[PDB]
């Protein structure tokens, strides 16, 4: 039923609006609040472990909103808890990375971070130049498409409800949920004359590559500073990534 598909569209968009962490208007209104060169230098002079700790904290809080987003997806809470965990462990960070495009300003290539907008040079103390640049590049691609709030809602639902995740017990059930969400997303694109973005969306594996890079860099950092991760990284971050 077209009515049932459109009810799903409304439900997913509402669930995202309730869990988007930051309203889009608040991010846009801060675009002229840009870090000075002295502030950028201050971030660059911070130790690697302190920059990692702060960034892991911000990622953990953002992941918490993704979990609430999942909990407001009716089909997601119908899955068994094993599959809920599998989907969240595999997809929560991917959802965060997609959500980051709202905090990215394509006009000057800056991202909102700790109250102001800064370029990727702000994150040099992490030692993750490739990861950070790829995140900027990914956010720039979605920003160039003017990815709407409703499109982000439906797309991030599909990022999470991925029936190809290894470890799923009720694979057929996730397949049905994924197909209904695909119909909802594509119906919304058709109704809004936005189907031209289908070929312009980032390819399959690009999001996985970003998540793999994050885990790989964390693996390196944890080898270098195991006590810092143990003593100062958020427990949810460690449960998800280490």
């Amino acid at each position: 039923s077209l009515t049932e598909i459109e009810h799903l569209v409304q439900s997913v968009c509402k669930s995202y609006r309730e869990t988007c962490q930051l309203r889009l208007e608040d991010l846009l209104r801060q675009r002229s609040n840009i870090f000075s060169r002295e502030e950028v230098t201050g971030y660059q002079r911070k130790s690697m472990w302190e920059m990692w700790e702060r960034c892991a904290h911000h990622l953990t809080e953002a992941i918490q909103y993704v979990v609430e987003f999942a909990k407001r997806l009716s089909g997601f809470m119908e899955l068994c808890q094993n599959d809920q965990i599998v989907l969240l462990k595999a997809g929560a960070m991917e959802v965060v990375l997609v959500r980051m495009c709202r905090a990215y300003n394509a006009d000057n290539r800056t991202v909102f971070f700790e109250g102001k907008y800064g370029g990727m040079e702000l994150f040099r103390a992490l030692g993750c130049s490739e990861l950070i640049s790829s995140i900027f590049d990914f956010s720039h691609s979605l920003s160039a498409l003017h990815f709407s709030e409703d499109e982000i809602a439906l797309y991030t639902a599909l990022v999470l409800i991925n029936a190809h995740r290894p470890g799923l017990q009720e694979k057929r059930k996730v397949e049905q949920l994924q197909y209904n969400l695909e119909l909802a997303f594509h119906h919304h694109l058709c109704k809004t004359h936005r189907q031209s973005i289908l070929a312009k969306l980032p390819p399959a594996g690009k999001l996985a590559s970003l998540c793999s890079q994050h885990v790989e860099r964390l693996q390196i950092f944890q080898h270098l500073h195991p006590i810092v991760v143990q003593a100062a990284f958020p427990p949810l971050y460690k449960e998800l990534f280490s």
Binding site: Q64, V67, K71, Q81, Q84, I85, L88, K89, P235, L236, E239, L240
Partner: peptide
């Protein structure tokens, strides 16, 4: 563990 608790809240 934590995801378990978050999903039940």
């Amino acid at each position: 563990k934590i995801l378990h608790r978050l999903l039940q809240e």
